Amino acid sequence: SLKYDVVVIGAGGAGYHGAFRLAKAKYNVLMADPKGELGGNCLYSGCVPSKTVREVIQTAWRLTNIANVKIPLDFSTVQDRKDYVQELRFKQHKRNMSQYETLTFYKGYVKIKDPTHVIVKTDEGKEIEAETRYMIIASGAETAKLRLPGVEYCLTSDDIFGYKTSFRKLPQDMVIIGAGYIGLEIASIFRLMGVQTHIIEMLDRALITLEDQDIVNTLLSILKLNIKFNSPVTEVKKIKDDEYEVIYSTKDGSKKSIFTNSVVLAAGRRPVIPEGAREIGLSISKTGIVVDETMKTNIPNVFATGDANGLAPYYHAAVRMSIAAANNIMANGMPVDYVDVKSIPVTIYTIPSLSYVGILPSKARKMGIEIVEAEYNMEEDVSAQIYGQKEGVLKLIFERGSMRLIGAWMIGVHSQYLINELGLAVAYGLNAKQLASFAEQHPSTNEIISYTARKVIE
Amino acid sequence: SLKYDVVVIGAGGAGYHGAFRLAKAKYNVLMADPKGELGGNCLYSGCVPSKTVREVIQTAWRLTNIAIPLDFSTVQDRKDYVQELRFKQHKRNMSQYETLTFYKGYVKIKDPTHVIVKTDEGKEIEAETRYMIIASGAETAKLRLPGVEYCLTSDDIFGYKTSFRKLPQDMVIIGAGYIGLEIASIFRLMGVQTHIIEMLDRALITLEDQDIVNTLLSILKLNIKFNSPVTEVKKIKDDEYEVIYSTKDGSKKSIFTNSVVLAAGRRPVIPEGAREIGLSISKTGIVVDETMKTNIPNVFATGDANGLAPYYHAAVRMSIAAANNIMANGMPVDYVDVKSIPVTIYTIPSLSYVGILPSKARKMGIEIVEAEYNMEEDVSAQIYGQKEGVLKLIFERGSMRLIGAWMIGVHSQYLINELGLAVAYGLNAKQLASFAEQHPSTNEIISYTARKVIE
Amino acid sequence: SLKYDVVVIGAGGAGYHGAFRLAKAKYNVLMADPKGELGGNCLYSGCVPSKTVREVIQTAWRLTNIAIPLDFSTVQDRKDYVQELRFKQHKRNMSQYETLTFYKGYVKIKDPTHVIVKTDEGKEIEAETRYMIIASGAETAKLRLPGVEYCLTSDDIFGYKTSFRKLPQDMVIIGAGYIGLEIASIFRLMGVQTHIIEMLDRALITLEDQDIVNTLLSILKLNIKFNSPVTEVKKIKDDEYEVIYSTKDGSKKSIFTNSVVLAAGRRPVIPEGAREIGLSISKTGIVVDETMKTNIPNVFATGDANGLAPYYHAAVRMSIAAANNIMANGMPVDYVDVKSIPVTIYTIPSLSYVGILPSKARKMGIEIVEAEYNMEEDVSAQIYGQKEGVLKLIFERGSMRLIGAWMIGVHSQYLINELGLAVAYGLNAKQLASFAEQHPSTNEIISYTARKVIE
Amino acid sequence: SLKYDVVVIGAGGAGYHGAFRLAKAKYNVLMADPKGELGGNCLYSGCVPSKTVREVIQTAWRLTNIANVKIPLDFSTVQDRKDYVQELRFKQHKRNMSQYETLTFYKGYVKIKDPTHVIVKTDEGKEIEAETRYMIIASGAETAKLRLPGVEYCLTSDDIFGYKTSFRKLPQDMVIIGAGYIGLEIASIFRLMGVQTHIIEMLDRALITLEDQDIVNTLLSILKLNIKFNSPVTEVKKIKDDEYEVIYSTKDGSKKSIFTNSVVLAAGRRPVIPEGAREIGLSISKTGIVVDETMKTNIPNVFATGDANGLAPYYHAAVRMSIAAANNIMANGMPVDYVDVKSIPVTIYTIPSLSYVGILPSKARKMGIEIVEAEYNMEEDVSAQIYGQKEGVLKLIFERGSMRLIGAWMIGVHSQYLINELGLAVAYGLNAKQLASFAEQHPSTNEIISYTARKVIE
Numbered sequence A, D: 001s002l003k004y005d006v007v008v009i010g011a012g013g014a015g016y017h018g019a020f021r022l023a024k025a026k027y028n029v030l031m032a033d034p035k036g037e038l039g040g041n042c043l044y045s046g047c048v049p050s051k052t053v054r055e056v057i058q059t060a061w062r063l064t065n066i067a068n069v070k071i072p073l074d075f076s077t078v079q080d081r082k083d084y085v086q087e088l089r090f091k092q093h094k095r096n097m098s099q100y101e102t103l104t105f106y107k108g109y110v111k112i113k114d115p116t117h118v119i120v121k122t123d124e125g126k127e128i129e130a131e132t133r134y135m136i137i138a139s140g141a142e143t144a145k146l147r148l149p150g151v152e153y154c155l156t157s158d159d160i161f162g163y164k165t166s167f168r169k170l171p172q173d174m175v176i177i178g179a180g181y182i183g184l185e186i187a188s189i190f191r192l193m194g195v196q197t198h199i200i201e202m203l204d205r206a207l208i209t210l211e212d213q214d215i216v217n218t219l220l221s222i223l224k225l226n227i228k229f230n231s232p233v234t235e236v237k238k239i240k241d242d243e244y245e246v247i248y249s250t251k252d253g254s255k256k257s258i259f260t261n262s263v264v265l266a267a268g269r270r271p272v273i274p275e276g277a278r279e280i281g282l283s284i285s286k287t288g289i290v291v292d293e294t295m296k297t298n299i300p301n302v303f304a305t306g307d308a309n310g311l312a313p314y315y316h317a318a319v320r321m322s323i324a325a326a327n328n329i330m331a332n333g334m335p336v337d338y339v340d341v342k343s344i345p346v347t348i349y350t351i352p353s354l355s356y357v358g359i360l361p362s363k364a365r366k367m368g369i370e371i372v373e374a375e376y377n378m379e380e381d382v383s384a385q386i387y388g389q390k391e392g393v394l395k396l397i398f399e400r401g402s403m404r405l406i407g408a409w410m411i412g413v414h415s416q417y418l419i420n421e422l423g424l425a426v427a428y429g430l431n432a433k434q435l436a437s438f439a440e441q442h443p444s445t446n447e448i449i450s451y452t453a454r455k456v457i458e
Numbered sequence B, C: 001s002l003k004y005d006v007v008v009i010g011a012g013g014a015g016y017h018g019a020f021r022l023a024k025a026k027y028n029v030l031m032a033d034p035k036g037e038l039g040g041n042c043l044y045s046g047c048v049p050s051k052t053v054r055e056v057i058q059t060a061w062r063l064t065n066i067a068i069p070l071d072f073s074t075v076q077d078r079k080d081y082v083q084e085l086r087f088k089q090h091k092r093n094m095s096q097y098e099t100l101t102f103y104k105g106y107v108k109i110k111d112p113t114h115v116i117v118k119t120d121e122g123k124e125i126e127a128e129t130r131y132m133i134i135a136s137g138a139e140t141a142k143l144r145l146p147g148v149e150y151c152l153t154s155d156d157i158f159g160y161k162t163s164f165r166k167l168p169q170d171m172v173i174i175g176a177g178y179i180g181l182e183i184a185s186i187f188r189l190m191g192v193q194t195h196i197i198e199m200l201d202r203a204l205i206t207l208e209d210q211d212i213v214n215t216l217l218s219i220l221k222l223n224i225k226f227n228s229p230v231t232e233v234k235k236i237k238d239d240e241y242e243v244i245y246s247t248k249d250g251s252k253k254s255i256f257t258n259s260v261v262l263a264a265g266r267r268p269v270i271p272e273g274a275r276e277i278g279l280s281i282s283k284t285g286i287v288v289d290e291t292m293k294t295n296i297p298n299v300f301a302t303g304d305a306n307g308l309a310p311y312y313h314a315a316v317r318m319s320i321a322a323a324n325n326i327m328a329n330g331m332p333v334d335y336v337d338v339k340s341i342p343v344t345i346y347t348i349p350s351l352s353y354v355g356i357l358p359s360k361a362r363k364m365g366i367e368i369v370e371a372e373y374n375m376e377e378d379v380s381a382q383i384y385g386q387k388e389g390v391l392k393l394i395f396e397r398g399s400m401r402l403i404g405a406w407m408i409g410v411h412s413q414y415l416i417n418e419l420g421l422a423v424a425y426g427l428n429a430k431q432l433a434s435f436a437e438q439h440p441s442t443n444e445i446i447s448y449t450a451r452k453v454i455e
């Protein structure tokens, strides 16, 4: 009834970067999100605040290893800094949005009527009915709605890192349900702030999202967390404030119990499908809305970007997917842009962190690619030594013959920065020689990459 | 005589990385350095200790900004522990190579194939060799003025086990070169009141782009005086000095301070006997080509002694190139591309740069487009309250090849390596735009900034 | 710059005795030597350690002759204990002088009034001075032949804390100069079979009198080959070598031995930068006059670096003379008389000599009378069974002034000082005849021999 | 009845050097000595054998300080070497004598009839009656014939050092009667060979022959001998072989006793006056035959040389005196030669030895000569250090004004060699400057002299 070029459902990374590119091309674009803010869940309660918290505490700890006396920091001060940062960024995305005159934004939820028609339902409000030529579904994911008694007594990430959260005081000890990336991250950071942590995992292994058990095992050997495997939780009991009981079965079948001050549910997140999506015939699987590499669904004027598709549930990937949807829409659905998920780096933000990119040795084995590995030991890097954080390794994965760098992984200080240099090499197929001949800035940690590449040849 | 395949004079990065590679291939190599340690001056008094001090005090300051006192002596203890550890590490690595012989001593060159090594004990070992690598580095320039004796140098400040273990309240720094700016920046953050006096008309002459230097100065806001040659330093009491200087016009002025630092540039170090054998040597250093070969065809020269790129990581790369060419018995199988080696000035915030910058592009006749990002918007800048700065990408029109980049801001030292790789192997704006940096690392601003040019 | 009155380069006897005297008068003096000890090469590897070995093994042998086994390692322990003690003694003495600053380092000369001292740490201290004393000594000559690397030098043999701690059974010595003859003599007495090969036609060229050298050789009875340049030293096994040499005629010959010593003379050591400032320098060393003043008028040169009299005690005397002249602000108040400095070649028995000898007297046109004594008749020679030798007094006809003397025999090193004093201050035959030496010291032969000329 | 130019009474140093010089001038000379050998008492039983013994034992001890294990030497082997040396020298003086055809030698004693006539009494023989123009009395001295009960049980120097002596076995301990030079020497050497020594001295002080108590005290502080002063011996008792009792009074008057294996009489020697000497009117005092500096007596054709005159009872002085007598006789009694006793060096052959020459500080004080002393400490000399014999000092005595070296003394290693260099300076009056400017052979001990002279100026 009002008319637009594109509707974007969801205003996280998956949505707004695309929307901004379209708007800049003078496309009329309607974006709607219930939060009424940009950044989605990742800004509201994921990466941004979690890293903020991670940095403040890492800075405290490095200083404690250097001045070798203990440093006094209240968790409420850490949570203030997390909020100050979230607040700057909400304002900044609004101020950047306000520059695009042909972009209209609504605080509300989009329901789909048919491939060219939607209805935006606002908070205390009416139906806005809209017509459109293309649609970008960028509705993200949510915390997995588990059916287990006591679920209501568990904290989630939203509670721990949410903007203006009231979780502002540390417990003496905490049980984390789940050994995936969110759980391990939470276990790492809270342990560093003085909390006793226990992880209980249903399955036999941590980090299912990473297919390579040898890499997972190396990280666990460095982390030395208290992890119980093969231990489904069957109930959470609340005794009183700050007193819970988590009940669980074991690999034998015998029930067992652990008492704690605080229970955190770190299950996987699940894709969020907008109302009406099934009804217009959109192919949807377990992992999410099915898309090809151009982000196009089985309905040809409908794209799906970010966690809604499940292809690579990390914020930087969602942004990349968003821009590719925008490009393809501008080219009127001709496939002019594509996303290469292999070459997207991933970081698990434990302390130390694990980063990786490309093809790792186990997938290489299954594809029949013959490889050669090069190895560096992080005890020998300058910054590691300064800060007293000497654990970890870098591993470069080269294909035999071409010696193309086809993959890389790294546990240690600054892996999040190094992984990008290496991801670039991987994405455009540089070889050991090119890596050896490059001369990274001394004394930065990136200097271990050309160094490690010089090794393989020698 | 004792016969060797290669003799490496100097055991800094310009020396030992190549020695190691030649030894790994079982060449018989002889290396000497008077310190009797690996790492050169860079380790003893340059990059490792200065960046260690820099990282420690910036960590103190970051935490200060987000929520504690550290004495300077503790910082300097940390600097010393790291130096010590790395000396031990290079010796451990050296012990792996059976065919590498190391002496504590100076090398004199006798002819293109003969050297003698002089030890302290006064022993002199004669040796014959097929190739030499001159990796003998550089040394502090020695200005002659009354009162120079009262000046501290960066060697006094960062030297291993230095006695400089207490902070003056006010400090005057002679030189606006990169060592001057770095010292001023770090010490200002530890609470020292700093002042720079520079005889020439500008800062950072090693950087041809004045627009970039002006941007850095405007963000750093240092008290600097230009066209002000010092004529005398007078001592009045302990921890009390008068720096006397001349204005542009010719009139005398003076400043009173607690401490004076000389930072006047470095000069290439030429081994005894190098001149006598006819090595072609300019002002800037031993003349070499890109293969690191000198006018004498079995003699190579690497690192600060050649003056092409006086940074440790450039030095390591040249050492490796010398070793590859020697192994190919002189054939030029390896070459160093200087413009694609990143440089970082370690002020706070730092300046990093690589490749071809606008001043140079203009002189070459290359037409360019610049894409830019303001560091106020970076997540890590926000977390730390370090919001000053800017990233600029330099693209070649037509190809949109990335030919240069410069950045002032936090983590410029990490970002510049990603960018340096793109410059080195010729990636274009589309390629950088299509790559997805790890969120929320500061690296995300690169592809973010490449996406904006395309818009 | 730091301002000094004098800079002394080298801390051997040629350096420190003068430094000490200048410091005693409160001059500000700066001294440097890379060993970071006083005593020079003489202490580290020359006279003190060699004479210590000589005295120990001659004491063993005397007792053997009058009535027990000593391992060579014990001798070398004794040599090391004495060296150690004297290093400590010179440091104790140096600590008495508040105005003397000592560095472990090399001095480079920049101009007649400026030096820089380079330390191992790599620190370089610039310094300005009114006077210099170049006291930088001498070094082993470096013959270039295949297998030189297998040769021991007297440095290896007598050096402080040397690893040479076990005696070979047979030894070949290259050089019939005084170090060659001394080494051969001592080691023969420890049971080593010695052989000398000398390229030139005679021994001890530093001594112009062939009659004297022939007398010494005829008493020493060493196996020596003349006109026999070595062309190669080959190693066959541990403790097994082939010395290959050419005859006068041109034909090749070889000798098989367990050990080879090179003793090829010493060469003067010239500080870096001395040439560059225009110091007049010959083959034999830095040219000086008798005041020790060089062609640069505020620069003096003492000891083996000048080459006039390359013996420690001559060096000490020149150091003192430099210091007196400096104190007189350059006026020539003190002079060294070389011919009146005694010399002793420390073979067993030794040869000592002083003043003008017959070869020289003949060339000058001085007519002489020689008085002589046979050492068979000396009491101490008889007690020890060391009866080989002769004392000769050289008298000037008319005056009967004692102008020279030479002696082979026991205690020649003590007797020569009495005689040197008579030569130096011009005593005549009557005066020596009238003096009554302590009986039964070996000195009684002097006045005994002066009484016979008068008869 | 036979006719000669000169008669020489005694064939020691005082006699034969003069005799040889005369004979060489073709003077007919008759020399007679009861020993029938040349060298006198000094060769028979003084310096030559005592130094021989001293050297062998010093060589043993130096080697013991260097190899730092003990060295085995029987005293009989030391006595063999003493005899071998004495034997060479008896033969050598005879072989040198045989070269002078106008010198006639007799084994016998000379009696003087009048200034021009003597009688030689041979061993199993007649009177040879002789006429002569000059006479040289060179009859030396003997061991002082003391009146004390038990004197016959004491050894003397003649017994200890005599040629072919039967004293060839060391006692465990020995009492030495006398703290003069012979006694201290004997105490030094025997102590070094393992013997326990005690010296008992009549007088209040050691070394009366040296007027300077400060010098004597320094030597005693280094020697650390067992000396009893003010203790005249009153009797020597023999219990059995190797068992004696020496009885003595003390400074109070109370008798006391010491038991020993061996008693040595080290009294002063006394001049020996030939028969007839008094009767012709020769002036004779306590110290000996009175002579002027030309060795001439009150009877003008009679000279007296060596210990017979008592002016300087050391062998090298006696030789010097002999030659001066020979010269003056040749010049027919005109005083053409003179002896300067001040400038004759003296050594006391303890271990370490003391040597001295010239004017010492106490005589200087009495003459009113103002002096300055220079001092060197023997711990710092090379040879001292090699041999481990580091005790002692060198002292140079300069007159103020001229800075003439007027005296010197030295306790330590090689003082006997150094004293000659210094005696030469003293005899011809060199000054500090001349000593400083001279450069003694390095590394000999004489190098401490120019060194010490350089000090005084500084």
Ligand SMILES: Nc1ncnc2c1ncn2[C@@H]1O[C@H](COP(=O)(O)OP(=O)(O)O)[C@@H](O)[C@H]1O
Pocket (backbone or CB within 6 Å): A009, A010, A011, A012, A013, A014, A015, A032, A033, A034, A035, A039, A040, A041, A042, A043, A108, A109, A110, A111, A138, A139, A140, A141, A142, A272, A274, A275, A305, A306, A307, A308, A314, A315, A318
């Ligand atoms: N029907 C809908 N209409 C509008 N917004 C939606 C709808 N369903 C979910 N969203 C929003 O989409 C956003 C997705 O953000 P996020 O979970 O960070 O995913 P991504 O990383 O894929 O952007 C959330 O802010 C959520 O409120």
Ligand SMILES: Nc1ncnc2c1ncn2[C@@H]1O[C@H](COP(=O)(O)OP(=O)(O)O)[C@@H](O)[C@H]1O
Pocket (backbone or CB within 6 Å): B009, B010, B011, B012, B013, B014, B015, B032, B033, B034, B035, B039, B040, B041, B042, B043, B105, B106, B107, B108, B135, B136, B137, B138, B269, B270, B271, B272, B302, B303, B304, B305, B311, B312, B315, C122
């Ligand atoms: N003649 C010489 N012989 C041996 N080493 C030398 C000589 N001259 C200088 N050097 C050494 O060479 C090293 C140079 O290293 P450095 O100054 O760090 O430069 P680079 O980074 O180019 O290696 C120093 O450690 C210095 O001591």
Ligand SMILES: Nc1ncnc2c1ncn2[C@@H]1O[C@H](COP(=O)(O)OP(=O)(O)O)[C@@H](O)[C@H]1O
Pocket (backbone or CB within 6 Å): B122, C009, C010, C011, C012, C013, C014, C015, C032, C033, C034, C035, C039, C040, C041, C042, C043, C105, C106, C107, C108, C135, C136, C137, C138, C269, C270, C271, C272, C302, C303, C304, C305, C311, C312, C315
């Ligand atoms: N450039 C220099 N700077 C300082 N000392 C030096 C230099 N060259 C040589 N030397 C030192 O000078 C000393 C010379 O002493 P030595 O060889 O014993 O001769 P001399 O007997 O003449 O003193 C040696 O210890 C040597 O290390």
Ligand SMILES: Nc1ncnc2c1ncn2[C@@H]1O[C@H](COP(=O)(O)OP(=O)(O)O)[C@@H](O)[C@H]1O
Pocket (backbone or CB within 6 Å): D009, D010, D011, D012, D013, D014, D015, D032, D033, D034, D035, D039, D040, D041, D042, D043, D108, D109, D110, D111, D138, D139, D140, D141, D142, D272, D274, D275, D305, D306, D307, D308, D314, D315, D318
């Ligand atoms: N009347 C005499 N006739 C000949 N010889 C004598 C007479 N009296 C003593 N003698 C001898 O004179 C010698 C003196 O020797 P010595 O005591 O060494 O004194 P000096 O050192 O004075 O020569 C002795 O050998 C002794 O036998």
